[PDB]
């Protein structure tokens with residue numbers, strides 16, 4: 064997270080930290096709990112072995128609020144396109160349900176087909192880098208403004224307004240960045256987006272997967 068602030072500890076109980084493949088550091092992403100046994104994240108964060116940490120603030124410390132659970136299945140959307148980074152969404156079915164408590168609980172999802180007005184203020188959180196030079200050990204967050212699709216439509220070749228959201232005012236140095244992929248974009252306390260990609264500079268606007276477009280697939284995968 065660039066341009067944000069450290070989150071009040073344990074105030075976003077749905078946040079998940081993903082350790083992808085061995086050794087401990089092969090790759091990292093964020094995610095968010097959507098049910099006691101399921102975490103939503105970005106498909107590009109896929110790995111053969113994924114260790115999910117819930118209840119954390121400082122991911123470099125053994126905190127007593129932390130629950131570490133391995134992902135039993137990592138279900139990438141069927142049409143995920145690694146080249147264009149399209150349909151960048153994945154469900155992680157946990158090997159055991161989390162023990163639900165104040166520090167560990169699911170976030171609300173939007174209703175299907177629910178859109179979002181440009182200009183809307185949303186919050187994104189994560190353990191990603193804060194600059195090209197440094198990272199963070201603790202959770203941070205920042206408020207970003209929803210942009211007109213039109214703007215991303217002209218900046219990123221493979222942008223699809225029906226499945227993605229254009230996010231962040233170029234005028235502010237605020238953005239999700241490396242390591243924040245898979246994290247949620249919370250708009251009025253509902254998880255509307257998933258951090259997907261942007262410019263290597265970290266300069267906004269950037270692209271988030273639009274969760275409300277995948278509700279039927281989400282619901283099918285968790286039910287079935």
Ligand SMILES: *P(=O)(O)[C@H](Cc1ccccc1)NC(=O)[C@@H]1CCCN1C(=O)[C@@H](NC(=O)CCC(=O)O)C(C)C
Nearest residue numbers: 107219239240241242243244259260261262263265269
């Ligand atoms: P996530 O893995 O932590 C990451 C998050 C991010 C957000 C905004 C800016 C930079 C990073 N996502 C990625 O690294 C994704 C997934 C692999 C490719 N990708 C990138 O976003 C890349 N950018 C693009 O392909 C667009 C480049 C452009 O139009 O300039 C690179 C690797 C940053």
